[PDB]
Amino acid sequence: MQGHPEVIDYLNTLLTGELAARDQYFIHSRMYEDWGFSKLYERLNHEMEEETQHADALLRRILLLEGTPRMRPDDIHPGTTVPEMLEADLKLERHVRAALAKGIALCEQHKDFVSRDILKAQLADTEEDHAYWLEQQLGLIARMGLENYLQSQI
Amino acid sequence: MQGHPEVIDYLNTLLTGELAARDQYFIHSRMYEDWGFSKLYERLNHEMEEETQHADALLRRILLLEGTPRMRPDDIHPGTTVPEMLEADLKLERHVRAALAKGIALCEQHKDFVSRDILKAQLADTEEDHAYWLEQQLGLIARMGLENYLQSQI
Amino acid sequence: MQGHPEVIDYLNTLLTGELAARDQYFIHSRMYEDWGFSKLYERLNHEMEEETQHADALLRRILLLEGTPRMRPDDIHPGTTVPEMLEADLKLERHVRAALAKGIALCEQHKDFVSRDILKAQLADTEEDHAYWLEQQLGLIARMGLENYLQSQI
Amino acid sequence: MQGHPEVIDYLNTLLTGELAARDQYFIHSRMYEDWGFSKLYERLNHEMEEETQHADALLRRILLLEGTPRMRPDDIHPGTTVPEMLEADLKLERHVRAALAKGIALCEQHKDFVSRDILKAQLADTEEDHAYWLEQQLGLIARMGLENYLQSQI
Amino acid sequence: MQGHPEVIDYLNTLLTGELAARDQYFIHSRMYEDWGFSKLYERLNHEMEEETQHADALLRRILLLEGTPRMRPDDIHPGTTVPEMLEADLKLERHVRAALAKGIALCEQHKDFVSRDILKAQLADTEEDHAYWLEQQLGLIARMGLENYLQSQI
Amino acid sequence: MQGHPEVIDYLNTLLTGELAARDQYFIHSRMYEDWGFSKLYERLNHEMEEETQHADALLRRILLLEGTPRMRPDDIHPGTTVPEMLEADLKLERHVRAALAKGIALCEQHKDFVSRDILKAQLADTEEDHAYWLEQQLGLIARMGLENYLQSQI
Amino acid sequence: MQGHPEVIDYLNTLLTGELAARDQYFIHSRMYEDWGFSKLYERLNHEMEEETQHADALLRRILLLEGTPRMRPDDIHPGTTVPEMLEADLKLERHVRAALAKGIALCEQHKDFVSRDILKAQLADTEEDHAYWLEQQLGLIARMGLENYLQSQI
Amino acid sequence: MQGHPEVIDYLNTLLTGELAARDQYFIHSRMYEDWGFSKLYERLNHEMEEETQHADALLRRILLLEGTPRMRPDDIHPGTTVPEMLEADLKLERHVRAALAKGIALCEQHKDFVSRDILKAQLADTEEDHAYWLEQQLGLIARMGLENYLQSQI
Amino acid sequence: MQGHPEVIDYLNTLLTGELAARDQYFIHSRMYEDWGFSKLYERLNHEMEEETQHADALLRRILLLEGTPRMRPDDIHPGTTVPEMLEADLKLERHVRAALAKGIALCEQHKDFVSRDILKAQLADTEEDHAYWLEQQLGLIARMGLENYLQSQI
Amino acid sequence: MQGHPEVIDYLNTLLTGELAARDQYFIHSRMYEDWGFSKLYERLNHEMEEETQHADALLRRILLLEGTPRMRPDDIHPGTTVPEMLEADLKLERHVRAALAKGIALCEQHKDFVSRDILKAQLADTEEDHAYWLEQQLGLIARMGLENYLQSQI
Amino acid sequence: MQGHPEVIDYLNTLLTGELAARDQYFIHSRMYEDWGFSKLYERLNHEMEEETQHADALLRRILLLEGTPRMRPDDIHPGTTVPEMLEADLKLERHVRAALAKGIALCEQHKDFVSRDILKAQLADTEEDHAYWLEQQLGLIARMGLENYLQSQI
């Protein structure tokens, strides 16, 4: 099916952002594991797998619309401490949230309602699983202190 | 069965207090969950379900006695921090305890012994599950400090 | 995540309407049970539990958006006979339907597409489970008469 | 254990009333069955078995207190039509309710709290199973007419 | 296998009548469901599935005989009330019965005995499942009145 | 619930197109089976059943909105060879895709968001199951030739 | 039971044709197996077993009618290549189809309706299993070429 | 469905013959049992149950056609010895065979093809189960003598 | 919860009496076992475990009410023969019965209805399990003589 | 453990090549799926998962050695036809094979034998699963032609 | 098989170091258990069992090569506090790592490749299980403080 060149281009933009998020979680999860925080490792490993499904859904949708997917992830910027890692992930999902919202309006505008629903599904994940869980972790650090928090994540 | 208009009126008073307690636990449990304290979420969610059964028992008993149940919850006053939430719940159960004790005497006085037994059952719950668990949590905060306490509730 | 103060305010409006619907079904179901109509009791009891999930979803969504949920149910207006109860429930769902439709447009306007999808899910329930089942019951009364209808609900 | 001669005498009074209720349900249930109303047969047969347990509990309690149980049932007065049978059963449980309430006060007065709790248990049954179910059946007849009601009890 | 052009033409006539019956049951069953008569919904839904198998058998038989099936259903004429729907279905099966009988004679005449047996199988269904069940429902309405009948179909 | 006469009219238009698609798949699947291509038979038989669910959902939705469903399928135009059949099905789904997109905009415009979501669900099916599978089959023919392709579908 | 000498004679004619078909499939299936076409072997082996049941049914029916079955198969004429084998089998079933049709008319004429039903059952098999499957195989050869076809039958 | 008065009349004739056959087998089977021939008892008991199904099918078919079934069995004529019983049963099935054949022609003539198929089913039973089994038993007596035969039936 | 200093003091009095009863049963059961009366051993061992639960319930209730439990058992006075042991246990439960009755009145007077219900539960045990079983054993000795009685308890 | 800065740097080089291979297989597998070659999709999807484990092992090993992993994949160069895709994958694994061989010598030289064994494990995979399977597919195309090959991969 | 006297001598050196590590873990694990740190006990107990397998593999390999194993463990130097114990274990594994690396080069030099592979297996364990887990524990102490760390190991 030949999709709208603007829609395809912006799915591609979203795709390189999802490939990035996948890779940022890949490195963060393994950093968490190396440091001995199994619970952060398991959660970031899970988010890595979800980002991989978000990427997959965009990639297949671009192929269906007869586009050529852009496979280079955006640049990632990993933290070097637990608080910087959480903050770097929160900044990434904030950016992804804003990109998706704009894609959603753009799909409405070109009357690509199926691409729009794909983006809306991913936006719910970004807001309600990923972004909310991150704010939650920063919230715990704020409430019990970093040391107590990190103990709880072993 | 036509019940004593005073008994029915005071069951109704208890009913609007139980509807309130249900709703106060509803909001507190979900606040606890939003902040990442799954264990407080599970316990307040459980107390919400119990308050719903306390309300149900009063409502059905008022209908059996051919009264018209009052379905407006009393005003609730949720906390904004973990210690204020626990304190607001403790103040609510203290009020409920005192209301029940007076209802129990009033049922004895109008010779409604079945309504009395319903209130006595709920009073045991209020004292021995709900009030005692709350004093217990404040007691833990007092003994290990708020940060350690909150860590234990993740 | 900081949501749009107008969106949060209107979710709050919807929330106090869902708390109300929950409570209206609570009293109607138990009235049906007291009168011996087990089948109306079971159905209204079920709708009460669904309204409780509708309320829960709004409440959590308001908390995620960093709003303060309004926990006072709207005023309810229960019937005193089977036909008035059904009519009072139909008028409630008609009002809820119209409120949701307006919320849906408002979320689109502030580009809160995830809140919008939450409201759309609840609107489908309101129209296709709840409103349609009520019109259905009035339709049966109209077709076989109230006495035959009530017999069938024992 | 030697019980208070007044308490024993009044348990005995309650006992001959429970033996009566047992026998009134015995005849009503079998009349219902003979006429083809299996559902009234099953319910009255069940109430007959419950009255037999109420009688048993009083009888054993009188023996424990070193009294001599009075085994003659009170006179019973069965109906000859479905509405008269329901009304005769409702009048019986109303009388039993009032007798129990007075026994409960009398046990409190002689400080026989265990006999009192036995009577309170039976009073809850009389009010909430038996009396409420009967008012319920008359209520159904009133709402759908006797013919529709009787059809539903086949 | 090259079938007789007259046989193929008349199978085609039967086929467009079966496609019609399928569609008339499709709409009637869903109308019954919308009105709350689950038992009429289930029965008409079942007849819809059977008409679909009758259509399928004719279609495949026409293809085997190297004909081109006519896929346009005949015009259908749904009722707007329960009695008109039953009557419209009875008139349809009466027409189908007569068409089949004539097809059966026509197959005998062109010595297509396998097409004949297919039509005879469907005729038994039309007479003994479908037509007989419809006369039966009208018969019940006639015997107990429409209101009682409709109550029994909830 | 009284729906917007324009929305109902256009659901009806979509309904007669879905009834058509159902029937076009009905004939194509059985043609495939007659020729010995079991795998095309199974896939078209499956699409026939899905079109039947698409039709069902529109029909019920029109009834809920108090419309009168139009039950005449649009005209269908079956192929006479495997490549023409695939092309005729692709042209049908292209038309259905465009009709749905316009219905989706029309529902948004009359603020019928539940009808809109029904159409969006079906559009995803049309694009991602049905249209994509057809382009896929033509793509295989183009890549390996018609003879090799048809061999693979036995 | 003494059957009509003409009916018995013609059952006997059909019997020697079924014995023949059995034997033609016997040799074809084993030729297919020798050449490595397991799928043609399995299908012809199956048809051989079915012809054996067709023969059995005629033989027993002739014995019941107090006839003497003729046990010499007609002459068979096996192919020497896959296309000639399929064509030789198609010519055999065409002959059997015509013989059965005439037997069916002859049984009707002597009022032997049970022999007639036996022949009708076998005619349905000849047309709808056997003849249709053969035309189908020739159809596949015509559509994908002999080499591709034979590959698919390994 | 209003059937042809001649068809109904002749189904009725067949029905009184099947009721008779049922009763003749009833008495023969129990005579066989009384004499100690369990195997003849079991077989005649089985034929009695089959005749009861033949009767049932005619009776229901006459009711469907809006006839009044004739429920008086024809006169029966039981044997007094094993060979006379077998012969009396063989004469009965011979008569039934001839009656059915004529009914079958009569149904064809009034174009009642479903009644015809019912009669054809029963004719196959009469010829191939019942008549053939009886000739078989007489055949065994002829081949091994009556004494050996009767020994084998204990 | 701060309980009434008088209620707490008297729970404490009851507690030291229950600790005593536990210990009196402890020694009696093991004396019974040493002498070879397994059945008296098992019953007194069971009563020891029940007294331990009675003690536990008082102790926890005193702690909940912010009292300091008194953990010294009252003085016990074990028998030296089977009849003196039974009599010493009967005198203990008589004393416990009277203490509980007075506690029950005292709780009513300070409006501690939950402590009251705890005492009422234990009073039922004291009267209906423990006291009644003891009178029962003395009753058996009186009826069959001590030797026969003791034989039955091996 | 502080690893040799040269070893870490070259693991990092290998890591960005494995991230690339993962992504090249990601796009190729989904391209294969879009075109209808399920078997190529499943195999490339599998190789994608294996490359992800190769990447994971390098990443964790770099972290253990206190290096900072480089998370940017090398540039990838996907094919646009089945033969170009296979060739692009073969060229990638040839490059990976040569890079690994050099890493293996480099680890030997810095006496990092555990990193060396990690690289040797991956080299066996690259040669014996991945490279050998690709040469194999090109070999099949060469032997049976591209069309036959692609048919076999549906 | 007669091994190289230098290889055997150095396996022996490694063996007395593994016997030592086994014994150092033996004492540390039991010290951890005595202090109440079950999780450190379980982990050190596990490492003790692994060191025992490392020792076993060296011992058997020396015997196979016709050497005489040296069974005296090296001197061990246990800590007296949790941080000194972890540090003493880390210093031991650092020494073992360096000894193994040199043994690996020495086996390569005498062309004993099987002894070399044994040492490489143990080196991977020393680096990736044992050394990495120890650095990990010190890392946790550094991140959350010793008290929080020790709490987590109870």
Next chain:
Amino acid sequence: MQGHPEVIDYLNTLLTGELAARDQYFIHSRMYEDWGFSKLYERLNHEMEEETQHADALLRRILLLEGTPRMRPDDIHPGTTVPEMLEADLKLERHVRAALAKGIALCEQHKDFVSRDILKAQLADTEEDHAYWLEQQLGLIARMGLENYLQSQI
């Protein structure tokens, strides 16, 4: 993959030695069985199967490297008595051990690390299963005498 002509040539040399070892064990095992030593038969039969896997791994590896495997086994030299057979097998594995060691160095030299790992795996088998088991058997003969040894192998 094109391997180094020297590596391929020497794998080929190893291959003809493994084919030989397979065949030497083949004859020895069956000689052992013929003489009644089931335990030597089972062990040599097992070594024959292992040599067959060693051969297989070399053969496949040579094919992967685009070499032509040499399939002629080296000359074998079986014993004629149990001690000569064991000695002939020990001399064979000694030769294989030395050949492998040289192949391992040669693979290192041409940077074929995967062939090297294949040879190292087989060398461990040759030394630790095969050579060690043989020395072991000679050792037993030396310790208990040949007669006792052979008895133990029945």
